[PDB]
Design a protein around this ligand. Sequence first.
Ligand SMILES: [Cl-]
Ligand SMILES: [Cl-]
Ligand SMILES: [Cl-]
Ligand SMILES: [Cl-]
Ligand SMILES: [Cl-]
Ligand SMILES: [Cl-]
Ligand SMILES: [Cl-]
Ligand SMILES: [Cl-]
Ligand code: NA
Ligand code: NA
Ligand code: NA
Lengths: 16, 16, 16, 16, 16, 16, 16, 16, 16, 16, 16, 16, 16, 16, 16, 16
Amino acid sequence: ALVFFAEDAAIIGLAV
Amino acid sequence: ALVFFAEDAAIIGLAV
Amino acid sequence: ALVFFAEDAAIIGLAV
Amino acid sequence: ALVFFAEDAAIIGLAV
Amino acid sequence: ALVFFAEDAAIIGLAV
Amino acid sequence: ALVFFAEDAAIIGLAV
Amino acid sequence: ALVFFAEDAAIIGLAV
Amino acid sequence: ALVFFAEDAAIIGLAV
Amino acid sequence: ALVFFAEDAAIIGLAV
Amino acid sequence: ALVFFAEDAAIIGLAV
Amino acid sequence: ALVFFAEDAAIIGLAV
Amino acid sequence: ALVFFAEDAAIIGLAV
Amino acid sequence: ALVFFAEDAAIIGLAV
Amino acid sequence: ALVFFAEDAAIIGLAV
Amino acid sequence: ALVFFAEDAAIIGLAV
Amino acid sequence: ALVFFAEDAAIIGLAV
Ligand SMILES: [Cl-]
Ligand SMILES: [Cl-]
Ligand SMILES: [Cl-]
Ligand SMILES: [Cl-]
Ligand SMILES: [Cl-]
Ligand SMILES: [Cl-]
Ligand SMILES: [Cl-]
Ligand SMILES: [Cl-]
Ligand code: NA
Ligand code: NA
Ligand code: NA
């Protein structure tokens, strides 16, 4: 899977 | 200040 | 600890 | 960016 | 060589 | 909008 | 009077 | 502080 | 390109 | 040294 | 004639 | 103008 | 008080 | 003699 | 590179 | 007085 990143603070991975 | 990023897991800031 | 100086504006201490 | 200072003579800035 | 400065108080040089 | 300029070093824009 | 400057594009004067 | 510029002629700084 | 500025009055850009 | 200014965006100095 | 600007400190005009 | 520096703690500028 | 700095070699403080 | 420092840009020495 | 010379006071090099 | 010039590095004046 791809992992995108976003600031949520902390940087988190978002899995696709 | 500058904030660098590193994978420590989770991505963290490092402040200078 | 050492304190280094940098312009960040204001002159700030950076502690090591 | 941070500007550090060093004697090189003359005192110069070093930009980061 | 470059001379950086730090408070160690007294100011000291750090040569590179 | 207008953009004014100031030295902060770097020259920055201020938007109005 | 003082003349300030802004980007409006062209640079214009603003009279005070 | 920020430094703005104006014609007063010669250009001068205005500190804020 | 770079844009230099000159008083020609009004301020104009000169592109390089 | 002289410092000239140009839009490069951001306004940068050019040292001579 | 054109007037260019430079920091010489004070901001000065340079006439061409 | 000249800018001198002093500890006031934090380092500050003094304009002359 | 203010503390100014001078090269005397070592960097020394001057207390005002 | 003492050497004080000021921003004039470049950092310059002032000798006393 | 070429080094040109100018009175800036003191005589300085300018590198091209 | 005459001023002669020598590379000493930097170019310096020598009074006579
Ligand atoms: Cl707005
Ligand atoms: Cl003034
Ligand atoms: Cl106009
Ligand atoms: Cl043109
Ligand atoms: Cl430059
Ligand atoms: Cl003050
Ligand atoms: Cl410099
Ligand atoms: Cl003296
Ligand atoms: Na502009
Ligand atoms: Na200058
Ligand atoms: Na001369």
